Design a protein around this ligand. Structure first.
Ligand SMILES: *[C@@H]1O[C@H](CO)[C@@H](O[C@@H]2O[C@H](CO)[C@@H](O[C@@H]3O[C@H](CO[C@H]4O[C@H](CO)[C@@H](O)[C@H](O[C@H]5O[C@H](CO)[C@@H](O)[C@H](O)[C@@H]5O)[C@@H]4O)[C@@H](O)[C@H](O[C@H]4O[C@H](CO)[C@@H](O)[C@H](O)[C@@H]4O[C@@H]4O[C@H](CO)[C@@H](O)[C@H](O)[C@H]4NC(C)=O)[C@@H]3O)[C@H](O)[C@H]2NC(C)=O)[C@H](O)[C@H]1NC(C)=O
Ligand SMILES: *[C@@H]1O[C@H](CO)[C@@H](O[C@@H]2O[C@H](CO)[C@@H](O[C@@H]3O[C@H](CO[C@H]4O[C@H](CO)[C@@H](O)[C@H](O[C@H]5O[C@H](CO)[C@@H](O)[C@H](O)[C@@H]5O)[C@@H]4O)[C@@H](O)[C@H](O[C@H]4O[C@H](CO)[C@@H](O)[C@H](O)[C@@H]4O[C@@H]4O[C@H](CO)[C@@H](O)[C@H](O)[C@H]4NC(C)=O)[C@@H]3O)[C@H](O)[C@H]2NC(C)=O)[C@H](O)[C@H]1NC(C)=O
Ligand SMILES: *[C@@H]1O[C@H](CO)[C@@H](O[C@@H]2O[C@H](CO)[C@@H](O[C@@H]3O[C@H](CO[C@H]4O[C@H](CO)[C@@H](O)[C@H](O[C@H]5O[C@H](CO)[C@@H](O)[C@H](O)[C@@H]5O)[C@@H]4O)[C@@H](O)[C@H](O[C@H]4O[C@H](CO)[C@@H](O)[C@H](O)[C@@H]4O[C@@H]4O[C@H](CO)[C@@H](O)[C@H](O)[C@H]4NC(C)=O)[C@@H]3O)[C@H](O)[C@H]2NC(C)=O)[C@H](O)[C@H]1NC(C)=O
Ligand SMILES: *[C@@H]1O[C@H](CO)[C@@H](O)[C@H](O)[C@H]1NC(C)=O
Lengths: 167, 125, 106, 194, 194, 167, 167, 194, 125, 106, 125, 106
């Protein structure tokens, strides 16, 4: 089947319908909040590693809060929830890319664009690795340019529909 | 209306084998523990054992090596055999229908339909 | 194994008096006890089950109570035909046990 | 510092998957030979690629271990998933075990085309389970298609206590989660009624 | 009578899943102790949580039952799915069966952390299989994580004929269908060559 | 994989490309026809319990009509078709919500909005349960309000494109 | 889960973001290149047999180029990649249609429309079979007509947004 | 030559599945009785529906075959997938085998409601495996629901070398790929610990 | 051109064992049922048995206990041993190639290539 | 078990006459019968298989017919070389049976 | 600081059983191969065998049938038994701690901590 | 099985000279050899392991080298207490073997 876990409501009011990664969920021990627009893509896309990690972290937090946590683990629980949380085929694709010598996602690192003035961002995409190191930014700058173009096009179309609605 | 008819010889000599049968006429046969009980003269009730329609059995430990209880669902009967009977086996023997309720607390069990009873005596005469 | 001890060994009571018989279990019961009446020359008759429920045809003067390890059978106004031997019975999984019995006589 | 279209700054984040410790196992690599899958903050499994075997018998008394029921259930589950994920395992003598006292010790004998061997299947499973960190120990003897060969003679899986072992790769649940779907996909039939 | 945005009336429907009876099993709950999974309008399985066992031996003669081939194939399939869905089942003495004459009688002995017990796995499987109406009989002793404990000593599954049993929950195929994907997902290895 | 079962053509001509639930499929023993707009969402969404029940009921009817039905059951048939009909992860999501004490869908009851004047409706959503009883409407009225908003917005946007097409 | 295999970049520059089937991949031993628009649907649709075949052929080519091919086959490789490549439920649906006497797709033959003047095409759809033979075109010409309508409507809508963007 | 909306020409293409031969098996049908699944350009399996059996014993020595490890691993994988895909298989006498010398010979006895029989399950799996060109040999005796009956007493699967066999249907990998997800889905339990 | 070369002693005494061998020269060994038949004097044809390249065998039930047929695919031969021969086993013995067609109705079977035949006489002289 | 009975036991005909022989099976055959010709001093020769198919080297005068339980071999115009013993043969799975044979003599 | 205390009688007659024990004081018991070695007079070192904490063993092939090595991880001890000792078993016997490194090339192994040693003589006197 | 031959059997060297001892394995070693020193009346002492690294407390004059089948132990300047018997040692999986030994004497 397909993943189904709904993300819990973001704690930060700055992103009304988005999602926030707290200081514990990040290596830089800071808070990163992504807006509703970026987070809505996580409901429809099937190949976004970041949206699978969001579902994993959210499931983790909710399970710790609503179930009585103990040190002994209920392996059964994650075993039954896994496919409701992530696309195991995304993992398989990254494995296939690895064994074929293609740069692949190891789910550690993600990049996104930030429109400084507004604070709006894009949905983070996994930072690929190859030969034991992260790709240098120049090797995938085309994808970054594509993401910037997409953010421009989607915003312009939203403005068009807005202008239409107001009039 | 439920009847249990008990049959079997009550006149025995030591080292023989007591064979009793109880036939059930009335109501279902599954879901009950068909039970053998005995009362020795000058003593109280003593549970011999029980069996259900799946041939699962329970026996009194003190008689386990000597007691065998069997069932025949084709004609709704159940049988008790006690091998190598000694003077301690003289008693009145009853077959009874037991019902156990374990679906909600308090659980309960009872023997509600009893047979007439068969006197069994063992002696050298 | 759960055993049942009945109290007292014998009772001497007059017709119309209240009869109280006790049954003590060696541990908390797997299921509530049942009470039988037994007369010479005839089969035992189920009086009470679930420690408080009368069987079919049992007059309302027969009552029961109890829990844990303590159970009791009560005859409010005992009739002349209530003089007999009374047994408490328990069943754990595939094991049925009887109390030694209590004799109720005039 | 890295602006795109003038107004888009390229920024990054790295997830701390260690925070998932209470709800899912986390695997990581310490070095070429030592790898770990931790379950919570108390227990886990150490997987070692090594020429030094620790078991020199042909037994794997799984039924007796189940009978005694002394092992950690999560660790036994991880062992079961790993073994069920191996493709085309057909040499039962290649797997030996010790479960006495509830311990978990499992040893795969990788000694010997190299593709249709227990070594290849076991090592592919290891690459998936210890993903993110296996590559340094693997692909030494390059093989056809997805086939893997190494110079190690044994893969040993033993239970261990928690310690900061993730020197070479960050802890991650991805390998275990990915392997969950692989279970029984490539097992052989050994009798007509499974 | 409930108007939204002044122009949108809130209306409801309830599906009669009973009409699916010929193409999929339907499970429902009669009360705390009694639950049912019907197959068509003629046969099905009664699942009872109870302190009263009906089997007092340690046999489960599955292979002889296959050889005799007298049982209902759909019911055997449901039994197989249920048993294969139990997580971490490792105490074969806890399951006893009677299949003589083609009947189906299966008895899981739930007597005894409570999480790493056959009782927990069997009861979680029962919650999924009898989903809807299970909750009233379940989680009396609240456990850690998803752990379930009840005061019952046995779960008994026997064949039965059709009757209007769904007093507590409406018949639904969801539990069975959902359990189909759980099959073999959390079974332990008992030998090296499956 | 993902579900694939195409809904059979609706009997009712009122909804040309929609789907109709006959008197047998409903507890109120009446006919409820949903339009093409609502039914088209069932082809793309993965978390709509109602669209999985629609696929189940349609599979049932088609099996009864094209295959020779007998009383002996073909467990194998539904066993093989199930994942082509429903997302088993949707079921897992409802199970996880149940065990976490979150209101969950038990696939019995569904609510939808009806635009009285026109008769157009929204895609039914599951009426959640909690503590053995259905949620009171006030507990999820915000979601109902959201559906009304969506039911307005998407239609208005269609009207915009309509204006574009006619001109 | 869901398929995840990304199509490799098209060799032909005529279709910048599309995909090309070389002479070996086709029975007519010719080259057929499909444009980016048709190929983008393959990223989001779940019931398109042709997009599953595209993923299969692309996986085959990439395996032959990046892995050392040998005559002995790595059954393991396809066994692990299959669900990342194709929707097995699509196959199940075609099986179910077959056993019910419904025309079904046997993944051999596909039809598409070609806008002669421009060279743009639609996403190929499976040519169904029934009674051991391919359906005559008149039996499914309505679906073909529907596809033509789609090719018009979507293009017109793009033109509308175009008019919006330029102004 | 067929024009739609006056501007849209209807055009066709047919995929050459044969080019996939190096990375996946390809099934095709030669005639009513003979069907093939090819692995590469050198080996494969011949599946024949026939009244002439070639094995007249009750053995299927799978474990000895595994330990000797002489067979083709891909072919054994195909055999395993096929057997694990059979629904409700419960008659171990119906399947006999010969694996001596690494060859593969497997024979399913189809002789005898026809739905709850080994013949029905075996033939349904065969229809899926040899999908395309199976229909001509199958459903001669129409059955209820998805039930298949033929006049053939045996289905025989033997290894073979490559030859241009696909006279009735084009080679295709679809049947094998589809059956991959059917594995173990409808197997019965034969013991409590599997 | 297909040839079946027969060998084995034809002179036997009672209680001995008859051992015949047939070697196939021409065409493949697989796909056929290599068959032993016998004709007693003043009697019709009698099927002894058959074997294929998988060592699967079929035997006449009236001789099953005492008859054994074996194969050797390395040199394409098959052998018949009949133990404890009595006067009823005096006959002409033929090896033959059988072909069975069960792929379409009507099924058929035939023995198309026959060996020369060996006379086997058993007596006390 | 399927057995074969041939009819008649002996046929007396002159060269140039039409010979017809019948074979009857105890039940509907699993496989169409074969017909063999047998002369003293040599091995039997396969004449017909599948009840109607001539073997290689068999002259066109040999024809066959039949189904179910009834099968027949026909020699339209018999030459002196046709005087021999004729056998019908059946095979079920791993069991080959012969008819007792018919003597065609002058 | 690790010591390997050694105990066991060194005076034996032929056909008896040498029984030696070595207890480890210091550092861990697991991860080592506890080893028995012997030196006969006028002879080089001879490896008797080794065992680890899982009771897996290795023996010299010339003595395998006659030698047994055991462990007890409760008190960190390991024992050597040689049965039916003959004159060839007179030697000095050492227990030692072996460490094998097989995690990277070059692999290595050594016996770094040795016990004092026990003289074992077998004679008829 | 990998066996070890030491060369030579005995060396006659004055203190301060350079001592070189060779060990040859029957095949390429599974692991690099170890070198032990042994004196009468006491236990053997581990000198070198991994064929080139000194153990604890081993003076720097002890050096090792080798690979494949050839290994060597070197004493740069030998003190009077260095005259003893020296052993090379190899281990394959669950099998340890010793060289026959080499005697250094004044
Ligand atoms: C996805 O792919 C990417 C890219 O491939 C992976 O990213 C790698 O992730 C690993 C694992 O986290 C990173 O390794 C870490 O590196 C840091 C930094 O090390 C550098 O700086 C040190 C000084 O700051 C320096 O000493 C290091 O060199 C020395 O050590 C290394 C081995 O670590 C040797 O190879 C060198 O020869 C040299 O001796 C180096 O230049 C390390 O600090 C870090 O180790 C610490 O943390 C570990 C995890 O907790 C602990 O297990 C270690 O014990 C260690 O502990 C800390 O060490 C500090 C430095 O000594 C010390 O100051 C501190 O007190 C001590 N303790 C604490 C509590 O902090 C670890 O080795 C690697 O660099 C990443 N690579 C890249 C390119 O980014 C990513 O993991 C992949 N993800 C998945 C899921 O697979
Ligand atoms: C999703 O979750 C929701 C919410 O949790 C679930 O909805 C529940 O579904 C169950 C099962 O359908 C509902 O239970 C039904 O209730 C009705 C109405 O009962 C009420 O009114 C009665 C008078 O009309 C009254 O007697 C009832 O009280 C008495 O009985 C109940 C037990 O039923 C006792 O607890 C009370 O103490 C009291 O004694 C009550 O107030 C019932 O009618 C219905 O039972 C009938 O139908 C069953 C199903 O066919 C049969 O098995 C029963 O025998 C029974 O039969 C009919 O009974 C009528 C009443 O006696 C009688 O008139 C009639 O002749 C007789 N026969 C026929 C043919 O009609 C059943 O118990 C429950 O109310 C729902 N809860 C809510 C909150 O809506 C939903 O199921 C979940 N879905 C899934 C898939 O899990
Ligand atoms: C999806 O469903 C569709 C529709 O159901 C399937 O499409 C079918 O696919 C099959 C398999 O490819 C097609 O069968 C092919 O047909 C062609 C054409 O045959 C016609 O023309 C011939 C003259 O050109 C003529 O002889 C034929 O009739 C004779 O033969 C047939 C059997 O083939 C008998 O039934 C007739 O009674 C008659 O005797 C017929 O009219 C065939 O050429 C082709 O066979 C060649 O190729 C095979 C595959 O490589 C080889 O195995 C064969 O040996 C054969 O070889 C070639 O034969 C040529 C003709 O004799 C000869 O000239 C040539 O030299 C020789 N060799 C080479 C190297 O070329 C095969 O039989 C069928 O027609 C399709 N049906 C439709 C309706 O289109 C599709 O497969 C399905 N897909 C899946 C995945 O299941
Ligand atoms: C492994 O588990 C066992 C369980 O009894 C425990 O005693 C042992 O200490 C564990 N091993 C390690 C290395 O932690």
């Amino acid at each position: 089947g397909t993943f189904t876990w709904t993300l819990s409501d973001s704690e930060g009011k700055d992103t009304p319908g988005g999602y926030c990664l707290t200081r514990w969920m990040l290596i830089e021990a800071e808070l990163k909040c992504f807006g509703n627009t970026a987070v809505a893509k996580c409901n429809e896309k099937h190949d976004e590693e970041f949206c699978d990690m969001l579902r994993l972290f959210d499931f983790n937090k909710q399970a710790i809060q609503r179930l009585k946590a103990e040190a002994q683990m209920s392996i059964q629980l994650i075993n039954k929830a896994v496919n409701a949380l992530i696309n195991d085929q995304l993992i398989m694709k990254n494995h296939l890319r690895d064994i074929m010598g293609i740069p692949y996602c190891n789910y550690s690192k993600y990049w996104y664009l930030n429109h400084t003035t507004t604070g709006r961002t894009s949905l983070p995409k996994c930072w690929l690795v190859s030969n034991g190191s992260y790709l240098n930014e120049t090797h995938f700058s085309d994808d970054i340019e594509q993401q910037a173009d997409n953010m421009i096009t989607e915003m312009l179309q939203k403005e068009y529909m807005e202008r239409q609605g107001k009039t | 209306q439920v009847q249990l008819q008990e049959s079997g010889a009550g006149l025995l000599k030591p080292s023989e084998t007591l064979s009793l049968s109880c036939t059930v006429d009335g109501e279902s046969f599954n879901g009950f523990f068909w039970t053998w009980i005995r009362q020795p003269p000058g003593k109280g009730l003593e549970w011999i054992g029980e069996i259900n329609h799946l041939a699962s059995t329970g026996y009194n430990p003190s008689l386990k090596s000597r007691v065998t209880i069997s069932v025949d669902t084709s004609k709704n009967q159940f049988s008790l055999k006690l091998t190598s009977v000694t003077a301690a086996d003289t008693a009145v023997y009853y077959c009874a229908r037991g019902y156990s309720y374990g679906f909600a607390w308090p659980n309960y069990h009872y023997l509600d339909v009893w047979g007439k009873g068969t006197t069994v005596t063992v002696s050298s005469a | 194994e759960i055993v049942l001890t009945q109290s007292p060994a014998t009772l001497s009571l007059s017709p119309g008096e209240r009869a109280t018989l006790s049954c003590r279990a060696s541990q908390s019961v797997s299921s509530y006890l049942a009470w039988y009446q037994h007369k010479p020359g005839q089969a035992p008759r189920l009086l009470i089950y679930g420690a408080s429920k009368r069987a079919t045809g049992i007059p309302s003067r027969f009552s029961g109570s109890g829990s844990g390890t303590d159970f009791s059978l009560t005859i409010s106004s005992l009739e002349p035909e209530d003089f007999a031997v009374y047994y408490c019975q328990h069943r754990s999984d595939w094991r049925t046990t009887f109390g030694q019995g209590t004799r109720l006589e005039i | 510092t890295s602006l795109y279209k003038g107004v888009y700054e390229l920024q990054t984040l790295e997830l701390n998957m260690e925070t998932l410790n209470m709800t899912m196992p986390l695997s990581c690599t310490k070095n070429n030979s030592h790898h770990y899958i931790m379950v919570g903050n108390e227990t886990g499994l150490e997987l070692t690629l090594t020429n030094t075997s620790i078991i020199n018998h042909k037994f794997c008394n799984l039924s007796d271990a189940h009978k005694k029921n002394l092992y950690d259930h999560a660790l036994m589950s991880i062992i079961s998933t790993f073994h069920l994920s191996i493709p085309n395992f057909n040499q039962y003598e290649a797997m030996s075990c010790d479960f006495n006292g509830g311990k978990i010790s499992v040893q795969y004998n990788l000694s010997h085309n190299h593709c249709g061997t227990v070594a290849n299947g076991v090592l592919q499973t290891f690459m998936r389970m210890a993903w993110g960190g296996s590559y340094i120990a693997l692909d030494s003897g390059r093989g056809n298609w997805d086939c893997i060969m190494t110079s190690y003679q044994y893969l040993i899986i033993q239970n261990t206590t928690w310690e900061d072992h993730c020197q070479f790769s960050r802890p991650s649940p991805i390998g275990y989660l990915g392997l969950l779907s692989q279970r029984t996909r490539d097992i052989y039939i050994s009798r007509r009624l499974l």
